């Protein structure tokens, strides 16, 4: 209730902090998440470079459309795990970097807009799973210890 609302706000903070990191905009889960999500983002940018070059992300709406279409396909089997969750943040960063390169409308707040749709997807698709699987401290961080 208030618990689901708190969960979404927490996910939003995680997403905002990750995306800020991605763009060098001025906690332990944040630190480890930033490192692993960025390692994924780098892998994607390097290995799927030609596919990423088939999109021009000229607007926030285009970013949202592509994010959702890709994520929907990724998650169509209904499988959730921390690996899957990490890839959502990563792909959000991938798209934010493209948006910053290709956006036509002046948008200095783009990472805020992207953080919102990324947080909504994470909450809507994986929010219950996260609380059922140890949360960020007793679930996600424990994967590295």
């Amino acid at each position: 209730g208030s618990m689901a609302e708190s969960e979404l706000m927490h996910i939003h903070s995680l997403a905002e902090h990750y995306l800020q990191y991605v763009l060098q905009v001025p906690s332990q889960a944040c630190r480890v998440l930033q490192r692993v999500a960025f390692s994924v983002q780098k892998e994607v940018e390097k290995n799927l470079k030609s596919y990423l070059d088939d999109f021009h992300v000229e607007s926030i709406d285009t970013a949202r459309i592509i994010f959702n279409q890709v994520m929907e396909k990724e998650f169509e089997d209904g499988i959730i795990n921390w690996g899957r969750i990490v890839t959502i943040f990563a792909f959000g960063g991938v798209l934010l970097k493209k948006l910053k390169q290709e956006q036509i409308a002046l948008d200095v707040s783009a990472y805020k807009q992207v953080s919102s749709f990324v947080a909504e997807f994470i909450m809507n698709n994986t929010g219950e799973w996260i609380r059922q699987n140890g949360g960020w401290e007793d679930g996600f961080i424990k994967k590295f210890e």
Partner: peptide
């Protein structure tokens, strides 16, 4: 086609992580 190969790569990467950490 591009969205499918991206999604499949993310699935593969997610799987790699899952297998490593379990």
């Amino acid at each position: 086609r591009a969205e499918v190969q991206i999604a499949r790569k993310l699935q593969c990467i997610a799987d790699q992580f899952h297998r490593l950490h379990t």
